[PDB]
Amino acid sequence: MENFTTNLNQLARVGGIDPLIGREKELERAIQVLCRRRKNNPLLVGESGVGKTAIAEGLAWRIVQGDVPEVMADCTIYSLDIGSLLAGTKYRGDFEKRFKALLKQLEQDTNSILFIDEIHTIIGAGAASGGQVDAANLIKPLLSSGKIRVIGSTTYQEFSNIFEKDRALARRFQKIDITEPSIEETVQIINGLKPKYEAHHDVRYTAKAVRAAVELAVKYINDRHLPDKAIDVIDEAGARARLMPVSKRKKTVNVADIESVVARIARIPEKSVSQSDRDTLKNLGDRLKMLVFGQDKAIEALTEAIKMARAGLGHEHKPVGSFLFAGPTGVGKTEVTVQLSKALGIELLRFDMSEYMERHTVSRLIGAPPGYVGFDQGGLLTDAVIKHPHAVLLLDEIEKAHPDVFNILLQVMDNGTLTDNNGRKADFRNVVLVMTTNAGVRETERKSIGLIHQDNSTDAMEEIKKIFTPEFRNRLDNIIWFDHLSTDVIHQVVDKFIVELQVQLDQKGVSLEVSQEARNWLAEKGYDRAMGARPMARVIQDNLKKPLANELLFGSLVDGGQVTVALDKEKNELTYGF
Amino acid sequence: DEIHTIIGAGAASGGQVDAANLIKPLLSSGKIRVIGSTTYQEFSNIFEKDRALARRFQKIDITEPSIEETVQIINGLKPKYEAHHDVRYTAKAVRAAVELAVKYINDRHLPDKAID
Amino acid sequence: DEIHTIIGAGAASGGQVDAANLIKPLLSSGKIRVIGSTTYQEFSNIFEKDRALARRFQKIDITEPSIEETVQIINGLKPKYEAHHDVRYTAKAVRAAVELAVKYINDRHLPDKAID
Amino acid sequence: MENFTTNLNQLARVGGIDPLIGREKELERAIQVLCRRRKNNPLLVGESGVGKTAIAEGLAWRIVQGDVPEVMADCTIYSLDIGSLLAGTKYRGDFEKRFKALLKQLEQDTNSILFIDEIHTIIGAGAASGGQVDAANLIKPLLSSGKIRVIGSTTYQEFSNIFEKDRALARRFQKIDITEPSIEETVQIINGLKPKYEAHHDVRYTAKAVRAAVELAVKYINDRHLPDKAIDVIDEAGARARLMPVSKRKKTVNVADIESVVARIARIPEKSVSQSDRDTLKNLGDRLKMLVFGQDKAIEALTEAIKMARAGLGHEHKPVGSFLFAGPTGVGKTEVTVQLSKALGIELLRFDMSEYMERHTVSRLIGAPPGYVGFDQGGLLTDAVIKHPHAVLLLDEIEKAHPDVFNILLQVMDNGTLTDNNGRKADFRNVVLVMTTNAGSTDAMEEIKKIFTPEFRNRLDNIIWFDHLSTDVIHQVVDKFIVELQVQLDQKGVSLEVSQEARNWLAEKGYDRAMGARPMARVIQDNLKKPLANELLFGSLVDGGQVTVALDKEKNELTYGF
Amino acid sequence: LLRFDMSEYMERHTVSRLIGAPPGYVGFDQGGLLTDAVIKHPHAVLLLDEIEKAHPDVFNILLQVMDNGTLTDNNGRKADFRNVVLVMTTNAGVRETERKSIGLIHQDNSTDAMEE
Numbered sequence A: 001m002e003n004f005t006t007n008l009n010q011l012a013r014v015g016g017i018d019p020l021i022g023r024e025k026e027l028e029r030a031i032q033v034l035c036r037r038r039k040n041n042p043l044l045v046g047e048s049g050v051g052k053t054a055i056a057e058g059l060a061w062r063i064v065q066g067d068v069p070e071v072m073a074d075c076t077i078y079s080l081d082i083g084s085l086l087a088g089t090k091y092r093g094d095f096e097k098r099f100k101a102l103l104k105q106l107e108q109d110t111n112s113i114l115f116i117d118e119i120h121t122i123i124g125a126g127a128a129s130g131g132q133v134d135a136a137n138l139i140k141p142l143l144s145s146g147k148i149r150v151i152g153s154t155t156y157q158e159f160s161n162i163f164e165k166d167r168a169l170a171r172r173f174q175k176i177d178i179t180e181p182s183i184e185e186t187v188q189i190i191n192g193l194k195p196k197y198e199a200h201h202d203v204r205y206t207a208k209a210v211r212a213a214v215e216l217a218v219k220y221i222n223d224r225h226l227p228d229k230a231i232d233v234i235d236e237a238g239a240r241a242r243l244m245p246v247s248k249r250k251k252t253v254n255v256a257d258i259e260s261v262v263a264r265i266a267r268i269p270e271k272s273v274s275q276s277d278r279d280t281l282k283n284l285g286d287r288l289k290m291l292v293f294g295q296d297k298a299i300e301a302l303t304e305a306i307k308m309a310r311a312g313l314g315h316e317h318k319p320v321g322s323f324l325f326a327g328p329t330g331v332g333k334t335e336v337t338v339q340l341s342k343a344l345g346i347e348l349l350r351f352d353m354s355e356y357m358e359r360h361t362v363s364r365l366i367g368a369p370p371g372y373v374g375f376d377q378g379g380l381l382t383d384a385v386i387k388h389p390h391a392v393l394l395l396d397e398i399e400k401a402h403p404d405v406f407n408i409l410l411q412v413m414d415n416g417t418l419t420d421n422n423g424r425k426a427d428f429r430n431v432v433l434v435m436t437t438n439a440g441v442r443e444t445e446r447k448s449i450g451l452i453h454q455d456n457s458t459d460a461m462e463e464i465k466k467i468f469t470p471e472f473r474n475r476l477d478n479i480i481w482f483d484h485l486s487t488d489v490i491h492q493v494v495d496k497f498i499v500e501l502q503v504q505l506d507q508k509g510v511s512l513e514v515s516q517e518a519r520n521w522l523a524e525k526g527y528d529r530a531m532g533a534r535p536m537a538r539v540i541q542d543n544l545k546k547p548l549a550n551e552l553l554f555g556s557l558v559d560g561g562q563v564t565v566a567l568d569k570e571k572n573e574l575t576y577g578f
Numbered sequence B, C: 001d002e003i004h005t006i007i008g009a010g011a012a013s014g015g016q017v018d019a020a021n022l023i024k025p026l027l028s029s030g031k032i033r034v035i036g037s038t039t040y041q042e043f044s045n046i047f048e049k050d051r052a053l054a055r056r057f058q059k060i061d062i063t064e065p066s067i068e069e070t071v072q073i074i075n076g077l078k079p080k081y082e083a084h085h086d087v088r089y090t091a092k093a094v095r096a097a098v099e100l101a102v103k104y105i106n107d108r109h110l111p112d113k114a115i116d
Numbered sequence D: 001m002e003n004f005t006t007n008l009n010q011l012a013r014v015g016g017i018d019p020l021i022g023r024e025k026e027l028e029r030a031i032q033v034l035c036r037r038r039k040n041n042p043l044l045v046g047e048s049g050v051g052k053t054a055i056a057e058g059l060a061w062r063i064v065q066g067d068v069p070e071v072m073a074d075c076t077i078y079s080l081d082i083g084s085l086l087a088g089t090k091y092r093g094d095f096e097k098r099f100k101a102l103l104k105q106l107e108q109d110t111n112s113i114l115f116i117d118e119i120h121t122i123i124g125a126g127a128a129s130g131g132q133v134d135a136a137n138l139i140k141p142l143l144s145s146g147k148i149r150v151i152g153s154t155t156y157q158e159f160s161n162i163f164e165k166d167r168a169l170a171r172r173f174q175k176i177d178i179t180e181p182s183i184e185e186t187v188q189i190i191n192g193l194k195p196k197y198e199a200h201h202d203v204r205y206t207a208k209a210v211r212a213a214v215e216l217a218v219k220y221i222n223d224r225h226l227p228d229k230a231i232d233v234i235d236e237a238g239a240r241a242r243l244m245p246v247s248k249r250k251k252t253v254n255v256a257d258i259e260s261v262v263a264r265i266a267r268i269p270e271k272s273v274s275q276s277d278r279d280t281l282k283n284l285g286d287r288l289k290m291l292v293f294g295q296d297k298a299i300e301a302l303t304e305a306i307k308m309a310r311a312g313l314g315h316e317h318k319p320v321g322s323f324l325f326a327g328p329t330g331v332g333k334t335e336v337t338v339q340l341s342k343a344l345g346i347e348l349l350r351f352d353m354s355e356y357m358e359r360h361t362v363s364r365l366i367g368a369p370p371g372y373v374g375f376d377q378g379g380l381l382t383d384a385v386i387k388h389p390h391a392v393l394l395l396d397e398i399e400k401a402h403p404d405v406f407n408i409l410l411q412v413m414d415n416g417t418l419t420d421n422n423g424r425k426a427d428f429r430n431v432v433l434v435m436t437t438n439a440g441s442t443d444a445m446e447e448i449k450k451i452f453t454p455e456f457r458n459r460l461d462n463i464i465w466f467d468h469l470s471t472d473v474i475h476q477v478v479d480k481f482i483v484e485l486q487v488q489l490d491q492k493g494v495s496l497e498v499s500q501e502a503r504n505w506l507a508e509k510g511y512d513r514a515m516g517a518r519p520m521a522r523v524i525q526d527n528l529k530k531p532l533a534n535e536l537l538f539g540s541l542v543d544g545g546q547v548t549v550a551l552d553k554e555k556n557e558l559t560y561g562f
Numbered sequence E: 001l002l003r004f005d006m007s008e009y010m011e012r013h014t015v016s017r018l019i020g021a022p023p024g025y026v027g028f029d030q031g032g033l034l035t036d037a038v039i040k041h042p043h044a045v046l047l048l049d050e051i052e053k054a055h056p057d058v059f060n061i062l063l064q065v066m067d068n069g070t071l072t073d074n075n076g077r078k079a080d081f082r083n084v085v086l087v088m089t090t091n092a093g094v095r096e097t098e099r100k101s102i103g104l105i106h107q108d109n110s111t112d113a114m115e116e
């Protein structure tokens, strides 16, 4: 019945079917199966984008071409359109008659093989309500009787969902594994298809553009298989070249056009390297050194890792870098990470490890299981990374996390990817991972017994070593011990905090001038190298903010104006007029 | 819009096949062109499950605008609001709306937090 | 065969839809004897946990034959393949099919796969 | 109801239901409950296989016979098919519309009684999927105000999972305790059912066969309760006997056929359950002496103790015996124990007591208290003795265990049992306890005695002493090792003969007064098996080959070739 | 090559999943990780990384395999290890050969890692 089946040999005879490239063994295996005594129903199983249909059509083509032995040559090969059978829509029982009429006629033709694409839609006869709900059962008798030979086609999940469970299929069909082609096979396939794309887009491709589409898609696109992933790049490059100009220019597509296309598909960056921003890249060290004073070594470690990735001297299975920051409190560990994401113009993903102190909570990172209270919540980490693949990832207080988080971190550090409980994957290769810790802190507050105090920083390192075991430590790029703030740093910190105050006052119409002597006094009064910068913020709050707050509310400052601060001879602050 | 809602439109028999199935052959053949639209969650829980349609579309990520982009969008739109309400906004009022909305409202992104 | 598909309710629209209960009077009255057939996972999911079965059926553990038996099974069936494909097999070839099968077959066991 | 229930009076009037034997008390109580003006709903609570459902059928039979108070006249007990009632719903309005119809048909009959089999899944929960519902709330105001009186049936565990916790059901039913019957009661049940089994299989059972079926099942089959498992033994023996006539065998089913059946069910070597043991015992000491050379006194002392246990002169509340095996390393304490378990046809359980030196490991053997980490993993000792109740239990180096494990041992030796952290009993009455030690008699005593104070030593049946090896024995041990290799080589087509100077050397080298025969395994393997394995695999020595092993006087190497 | 990392099996909580013990894990119908691997790839080399970290119950199972070649799963399957090579990797005692002495020479030794 011509209403439901397409004669593929007829298509090959009047063209319609292209020659198959690189799957000659696959066709011979299918023929070998068709000529068997039992299970002579080959089933082609493979990944999306690898040519499963192309192979089935390729057989009809070879029959017509004359490359098939007399055992199967001149056999009619037909392709079944389920949508046609189920298009009748109306009248219960007519669906079953249409299905049967087709099968009876195919049985009668005898020297006929039926090809069913998407065979898994027959088994269970899906169509919301269904078929021909028993379409599988209606065909099974001819498969069991050895009367019809069916070439199937499906994928791996569906093979498992149905073919591995329904023994009436398991004992009738013979699975053939159809794999993705090689780089060279893909190029040959593209070149075979090529004129179709060139004709559609009125473009031409260079040999290099073809090779590049294959190599770049393989390097960066991980949700597809060859040849389609490369074909897709070729088609998009074609459209890009076609639509880009006003005048018929740049008709020939080159590698650079391919690079732009792959870069835009993966939401990655490209390859200038310093695209048009290598000149902002070179200044990270300074933009950060103006915000974090001291700790130059931490700034540099981060800065160099970023440049290496941009320079191409990286590793395509690793995070951009993996750092553990440690040191005395109040020294800028989290300060540096936050400013880095700003300096780079990217999103910061923050997780606070103290909230994940139970094994139950790793479900809040991977994603709640199908289905217990729901499951329609992916992992917090998985979704954050997919939405923002270039983010800086900051995990605070890592030593406070439940130990199972480390199994998760080691996986990410080892291969660059984490799989969600729903099967989706997060790509961490463009993500910078920084973890911070206070693991050795209790040691730096300890005092020695004696006349001369000792340096306890080596004890702090021993504590780190006993928490983060060698298998973890051996996967990091750097464990960086941040220093205590020197007096010179304190002076820079005081100015930083004064500026933040000046900015807040400006919104009230109040300007503020502080003398150098007043600053020197606050700097002397406000710090302890053992405490870090946090106490400096506190001295400013008591010496400058309190007096101002009273005036802003009841002080002459209620309407805006100017204040100054001077230090007097008693080292007291001398207040403002207005 | 809300393309994940086209799945299951027809329903409950008498073999009544629904939509987003009745359309597979037209997207597959290149006969028609469509534009889809989903949120990340809707497209992470419903839309993607029917792999056949997921394969016929190109996913384009629409990200949140920057602060300056938001200000510019508002300047472009403000004549609609001025006309509607018989008001005039100052230049400072627009920039303040964007900065304050970002600092204090954490429920939505830009430029909605500012337009509202 | 595949008795667990008869035991579960909802075997098919129409089915056998109520097969699960329709078989019970026969198992209970003894008018018709049943020999069933299933696998190990289905057995523990269906029979071990249901009084309807735990009070009606016995289990016989069916395991694979020996390597020598696999060869004899083929030799018993062998003439059919020789006739079907107009071929003859070397006794060593029969043994090789089995001896090599044990180095790569576990996707299904022997003899069915050595026969293939 | 026609397609949901079965009329048990209709079956009783025809056949179907066997009269019950000996459960008059359970039936009298069920009647008192049914006769109440309210909450006249008995709930039968038991174990599987104890007459739990048989009672409901038994009552329907009495009713058609008329052996009931007039109160019960004209009553009909309908059995509910839960699967029929629950299957085929899906939509939200279907369960009720079906259950509502079932009840009105039953309700119209004031003498109707509904029987729910295993009431612990059709009362919630249960699984609320599509069409609602796996519910009892729907009955709950019926058999509680009320007009319908349903006989329930469940098990002790399910009872406490639902009832008690849900008062909604707990107070609508009267609980009736159904306990497993005794040996005598089981025999009487069989005798009354027997005529139908004899007719079915064209067999006759002896009186002894019936008693044996009951007692052997109790001793060897630990999967099921008595009044049911004893029936399988009778019916299975009958079934084989029904097929036996193909070889012209006889109608009578004797004890031997019962024994074959029990051993088959329990997965025990044939007839090791009964009389193969008499010949084994006659030859037990002799067989052990063929594998262990020397230690003749030890083997004989052990053999005699075993025989009196087998003779039945021991105690029920004890292990079948408790022995301490004392002596030097490598003298066969372990080897005798291993061969003994094989000789007797039973499995061996082994524990290394050196792994239980620390205080927290004591709970490792029994199981942690509930709420403590790992309690749900169970113990190591008590599950082993539940799974394998007839095993040989060997405890190595019991002269190193933490003192608390000795309290575990004293309890076992004293009364035969331990309680698991899940409340289950580990029954040691059919196992034999062998403990080994390097303690040594006064000194051996003080070193073990230190924990095995008189309070412990009085619980041992004996002390078996294991002697040092003589020079003749070390030569015999080597001959055994060489022979095992000779057998493997014959199977591979190679003949091997080791010279006398080669045997003397290996015996002298592989024996150490401080390790006994233990080092022998490597001396033989490294000097003889290894060099030979290399040649055989290389193919210089092939099937049909012969090697003779001589010593090189200046090296003492084992030298041979072909 | 089959691989397992013993650092993931430092407690009974996860050991049962590796073993395939009938009780003790989710996904029991699929058996153990170990027993399935030995069925799919019966001739494989089995590598256990960082064995000194393994919980004692892992060791009880390894001893069972060493004694008779078989572990039994409760889904009607057995892990037959007679065709595999078992390799354990350790770092025991390595640290002790890098220990410093308490002498003016010092050097003293090269210790034996076998002690650990």
Ligand SMILES: Nc1ncnc2c1ncn2[C@@H]1O[C@@H](COP(=O)(O)OP(=O)(O)OP(O)(O)=S)[C@H](O)[C@H]1O
Pocket: A291, A292, A293, A294, A295, A328, A329, A330, A331, A332, A333, A334, A335, A336, A436, A438, A493, A496, A533, A534
């Ligand atoms: N080198 C620095 N330059 C300027 N400000 C700094 C510097 N170091 C610390 N600060 C200030 O003190 C920091 C207080 O917050 P954090 O930086 O997160 O503290 P931390 O150093 O990360 O240590 P923790 O996380 O509180 S234990 C602020 O980042 C800064 O205002």
Ligand SMILES: Nc1ncnc2c1ncn2[C@H]1O[C@H](COP(=O)(O)OP(=O)(O)O)[C@@H](O)[C@H]1O
Pocket: D291, D292, D293, D294, D327, D328, D329, D330, D331, D332, D333, D334, D335, D336, D436, D466, D469, D473, D477, D516, D517, D518, D519, D520, D521
């Ligand atoms: N007559 C024997 N005496 C001692 N050991 C023997 C004898 N025959 C065999 N063996 C076995 O001796 C060693 C094991 O000894 P074992 O039973 O463990 O002694 P024990 O338990 O007293 O320490 C192995 O060489 C094995 O062959």
Ligand SMILES: Nc1ncnc2c1ncn2[C@H]1O[C@H](COP(=O)(O)OP(=O)(O)O)[C@H](O)[C@H]1O
Pocket: A018, A019, A020, A021, A022, A023, A046, A047, A048, A049, A050, A051, A052, A053, A054, A055, A181, A189, A193, A227, A228, A231
């Ligand atoms: N080796 C080949 N020779 C000829 N055409 C091929 C080959 N491989 C793939 N194809 C063709 O099939 C691919 C599409 O896959 P298809 O056969 O429809 O199965 P699926 O739907 O799973 O992706 C390519 O887009 C198309 O050009």
Ligand SMILES: Nc1ncnc2c1ncn2[C@H]1O[C@H](COP(=O)(O)OP(=O)(O)O)[C@H](O)[C@H]1O
Pocket: C055, D018, D019, D020, D021, D022, D023, D047, D048, D049, D050, D051, D052, D053, D054, D055, D189, D193, D227, D228, D231
């Ligand atoms: N006292 C008895 N008199 C007659 N038959 C009995 C008696 N006790 C038990 N039976 C017989 O009926 C029983 C029916 O099963 P039963 O023990 O009541 O509950 P369940 O089906 O849950 O295991 C036994 O399987 C069977 O041997």
